[PDB]
Amino acid sequence: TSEQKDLTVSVPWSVQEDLLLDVAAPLLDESVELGETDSWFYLRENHGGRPFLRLRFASRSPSVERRLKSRILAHVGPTIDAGDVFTYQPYNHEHDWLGGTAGLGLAENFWTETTPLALDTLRATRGNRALRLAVAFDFLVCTGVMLAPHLPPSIAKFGYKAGYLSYLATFEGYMLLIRDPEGTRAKHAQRYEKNRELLRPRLRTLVEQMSEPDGELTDVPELAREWLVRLRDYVPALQKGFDEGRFYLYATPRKAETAPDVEWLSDLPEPPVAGIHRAIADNTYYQGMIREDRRFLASRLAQAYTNWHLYRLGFLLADRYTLFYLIARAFEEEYDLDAAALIRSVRPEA
Numbered sequence: 447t448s449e450q451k452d453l454t455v456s457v458p459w460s461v462q463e464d465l466l467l468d469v470a471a472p473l474l475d476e477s478v479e480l481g482e483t484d485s486w487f488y489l490r491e492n493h494g495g496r497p498f499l500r501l502r503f504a505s506r507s508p509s510v511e512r513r514l515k516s517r518i519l520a521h522v523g524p525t526i527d528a529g530d531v532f533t534y535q536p537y538n539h540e541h542d543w544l545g546g547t548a549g550l551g552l553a554e555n556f557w558t559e560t561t562p563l564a565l566d567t568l569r570a571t572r573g574n575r576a577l578r579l580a581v582a583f584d585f586l587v588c589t590g591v592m593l594a595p596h597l598p599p600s601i602a603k604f605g606y607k608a609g610y611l612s613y614l615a616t617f618e619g620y621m622l623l624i625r626d627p628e629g630t631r632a633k634h635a636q637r638y639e640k641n642r643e644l645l646r647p648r649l650r651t652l653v654e655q656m657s658e659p660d661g662e663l664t665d666v667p668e669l670a671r672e673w674l675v676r677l678r679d680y681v682p683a684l685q686k687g688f689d690e691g692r693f694y695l696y697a698t699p700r701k702a703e704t705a706p707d708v709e710w711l712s713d714l715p716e717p718p719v720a721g722i723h724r725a726i727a728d729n730t731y732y733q734g735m736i737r738e739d740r741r742f743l744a745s746r747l748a749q750a751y752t753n754w755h756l757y758r759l760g761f762l763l764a765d766r767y768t769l770f771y772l773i774a775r776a777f778e779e780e781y782d783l784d785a786a787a788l789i790r791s792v793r794p795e796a
């Protein structure tokens with residue numbers, strides 16, 4: 447009865463937001479309330495330097511997609527070109543690191559159910575980049591604390607410190623791929639110095655408000671709270687997917703995607719991050735746990751949902767990694783943490 451629809455609108459990021467809040471969500475919410483459409487969600491993605499808003503919805507009626515297109519044209523005005531903004535960019539049913547084919551329904555469920563939150567977040571911070579960054583800081587800090595008790599017990603013991611290790615691992619992992627790691631880190635560190643006195647007490651307060659991460663979270667800011675309870679509601683189903691052999695974390699290469707003696711001539715000393723990589727390299731158990739423990743795999747899938755949510759809110763790579771870096775540094779200084787020492791202490795229990 448219902449047919450899967452998929453519409454992509456290739457316009458600048460800021461225009462995607464206007465269309466979403468002023469044209470697309472009111473139309474699609476109305477269509478849902480009338481039963482013309484079953485449900486909908488949106489993604490924001492990019493192909494070849496052409497950002498686009500994706501609207502995905504199941505509807506019996508061909509009119510819904512057509513009404514959407516025609517009202518998008520009315521909103522933007524005759525300035526943009528209709529024959530260029532609707533170039534179809536095909537939906538990926540097998541997104542990297544999102545659980546594989548068997549995980550698609552759960553991800554689409556999650557996106558549908560968090561679409562009101564995403565829209566409310568955009569509306570509350572419309573035209574206010576600093577407020578939207580603060581909102582993102584809030585739910586990212588809380589997510590690392592909330593997920594910690596669902597980790598394998600040998601890392602779940604860390605509590606909120608497992609949030610620190612997570613954001614640090616994400617940042618340092620990307621440092622291994624880039625052209626100038628030391629120059630890029632220096633710029634992030636410069637940014638932390640400017641914001642340290644604001645970030646550290648904000649972070650400690652969020653962690654305190656997350657002290658019972660299984661509870662009602664009544665002191666957490668409203669938008670973060672809604673994010674946390676919804677993601678946490680999905681954790682059992684994330685865990686069940688892996689436990690039952692259905693979910694797998696992988697990437698897929700696309701169609702036709704091919705795949706001196708410093709120790710002596712030294713006079714700059716060891717980087718502090720080198721101690722951290724040595725720590726991981728020496729901890730075989732930790733390595734296996736990250737790759738194969740099903741509670742960790744479920745955590746990584748919730749991690750991917752969190753990253754997708756940043757992207758649905760319009761945070762591009764630079765902003766996302768700034769947030770990860772700022773959070774990690776603030777954890778590190780506020781609680782006097784030693785990542786190498788924490789990594790070294792992860793051992794099998796019993």
Ligand SMILES: OCCOCCOCCOCCOCCOCCOCCOCCOCCOCCOCCOCCOCCO
Nearest residue numbers: 543589590593608611612616745746749750752753754757
């Ligand atoms: O790695 C290379 C990245 O470079 C970009 C590669 O190509 C870009 C492709 O475009 C996609 C842009 O959109 C981003 C959408 O994200 C896709 C899904 O991401 C997969 C997983 O991301 C891991 C990074 O997570 C950041 C958010 O972290 C949330 C906090 O997690 C809490 C704890 O999670 C792990 C538990 O760790 C315990 C300690 O070890």
